[PDB]
Amino acid sequence: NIKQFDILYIDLNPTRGREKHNVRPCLVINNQMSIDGTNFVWVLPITTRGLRYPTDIQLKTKKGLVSGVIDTVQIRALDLKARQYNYKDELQDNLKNDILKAIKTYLKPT
Amino acid sequence: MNIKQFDILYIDLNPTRGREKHNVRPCLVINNQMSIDGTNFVWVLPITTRGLRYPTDIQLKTKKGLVSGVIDTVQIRALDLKARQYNYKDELQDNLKNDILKAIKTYLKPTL
Amino acid sequence: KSIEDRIKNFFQSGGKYTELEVDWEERVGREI
């Protein structure tokens, strides 16, 4: 029920602190086989700071329900069997290739 | 204290705050030199002390033989080297470098 | 201009990303 380039609200601190206080929007970037086979998502943060770097991508979504800046430099793998999450929106098609090409630019040997 | 792609570091993976736990764990660095130098972050895959279990596991082999275990390619993480204790320990053998990156691309490759 | 060119040119000119880690420090479940 989760696919690549979905935007989820995820509880990023479920066991500590105030209840449902760190529930943030995250862009899923791993693919369908990876999600279904591992039950982890790879996510980039959608942040409320302004655009500052060429690595930043302004978020555009299909339903307009989430706004912010995708920081492509920070990535994490989250276990969705252990965290509450909710599908909220999804990335516009015309940004998807930019996302994957930014990531590849961090991985290709210098 | 300078780091390159495919180095193995011991890095404090614990939260920076409200923590007593400060042990370091071995991690493989997978982002490239340009982004390490430009950001002070490493993208790492953790090394864990089991045998091969999962299809996503890659057996670690290093140049100096100092670290052993399984590379867990699922659990990628961006870490700020300015915020955490870290220590260079070894380097991935050259013959595994393309396999790592191919495994990572496998998880990002989109579908219709 | 391609985004990979723009990122590469940024870093090669001496541009620096200077953010701290975003607010996802905690590990739960199978996360390691």
- From the list B104, B105, B108, B107, the residue with the least C-alpha distance to B44 is B104
Q: Is A53 exposed, middle or buried (0-12, 13-18, 19+ CB in 10 A)?
A: buried
Question: What secondary structure letter does DSSP report for C19?
Answer: P
**Could you give the CA distance from residue C1 to residue B112 in angstroms, rounded to a whole number?**
26
**Alpha helices, DSSP H only, in A1-110?**
32-38, 93-107
Q: Is B71 exposed, middle or buried (0-12, 13-18, 19+ CB in 10 A)?
A: buried
Test C26 with B15 for CB contact under 8 angstroms: yes
Question: What secondary structure letter does DSSP report for C20?
Answer: P
B 34-93 residues inside an 8 A Cβ radius of A: 34-35, 39, 41, 43, 55-56, 74-78
Beta bridge partners of B8: B28, B90
**Could you give the CA distance from residue A61 to residue A46 in angstroms, rounded to a whole number?**
12
φ, ψ of residue B102 to 5 degrees: the values are -65, -40
**Chains with 3 or more CB pairs under 8 A to chain B:** A, C
- Identify the H or E element spanning B10: strand B7-12
Lookup result for tokens 């991508």: A57
Judge whether A110 is closer than 8 Å to chain B, CB to CB: yes
**Could you give the CA distance from residue A19 to residue C5 in angstroms, rounded to a whole number?**
43
With b meaning 16 or more CB within 10 Å and e meaning fewer, what string describes B21-41? eeebbbbbbbbbebbbebbbb
- Give B98's contacts (C-beta < 8 A, 6+ positions apart): none
Task: Measure CA A22 to chain center.
Answer: 15
Test C3 with A79 for CB contact under 8 angstroms: no
Give resolution, Å, one decimal.
2.0
Residues of C in contact with B72 (CB under 8 A): 32
- Identify the H or E element spanning B101: helix B94-108
CA distance B42 to chain C (A): 11
Tokens of C20: 């701290």
- Give C4's contacts (C-beta < 8 A, 6+ positions apart): A101, A102, A104, A105
Test B108 with A105 for CB contact under 8 angstroms: no
Q: How was this structure determined?
A: X-ray
Beta bridge partners of A61: A91
For chain A, how many structural domains are there in total?
1
Question: What secondary structure letter does DSSP report for A61?
Answer: B
Domain extent for B44? 1-112
Judge whether B39 is closer than 8 Å to chain C, CB to CB: yes
Instruction: Give the chain A residue nearest C15 (alpha carbons).
Output: A53
**Could you give the CA distance from residue A105 to residue A92 in angstroms, rounded to a whole number?**
21
Distance of CA B48 to CAs A87, B26, B55, B69, Å? 31, 8, 15, 5
Beta bridge partners of A86: A9
- From the list A16, A44, A14, A18, the residue with the least C-alpha distance to A29 is A44
Lookup result for tokens 């706004």: A67
Tokens of A107: 């991985």
**DSSP for A4-33?**
TTEEEEEES-SSSSSTT-SEEEEEE-S-HH
Tokens of B58: 């890659």
HSE (side-chain half, CA atoms, 13 Å) at C21: 22
**DSSP for A31-42?**
-HHHHHHHSEEE
φ, ψ of residue B11 to 5 degrees: the values are -135, 140
**Could you give the CA distance from residue B50 to residue A8 in angstroms, rounded to a whole number?**
32
**Chains with 3 or more CB pairs under 8 A to chain C:** A, B
**Could you give the CA distance from residue A35 to residue B17 in angstroms, rounded to a whole number?**
30
Long-range contacts of A15-22 (CB under 8 A, 24+ apart): A15/C26, A15/C28, A16/B18, A16/C26, A20/A84, A22/C23
Beta bridge partners of B58: B71
Judge whether B80 is closer than 8 Å to chain C, CB to CB: yes
**Could you give the CA distance from residue A17 to residue C28 in angstroms, rounded to a whole number?**
14
Please name the member of A42, A73, A110 whose beta carbon is closest to the beta carbon of B33.
A110
Query: Do A102 and A57 form a contact (C-beta atoms < 8 A)?
Result: yes
Mutate to test the interface with A, among B108, B109, B111 (most CBs of A within 10 A): B108
- Identify the H or E element spanning B81: none
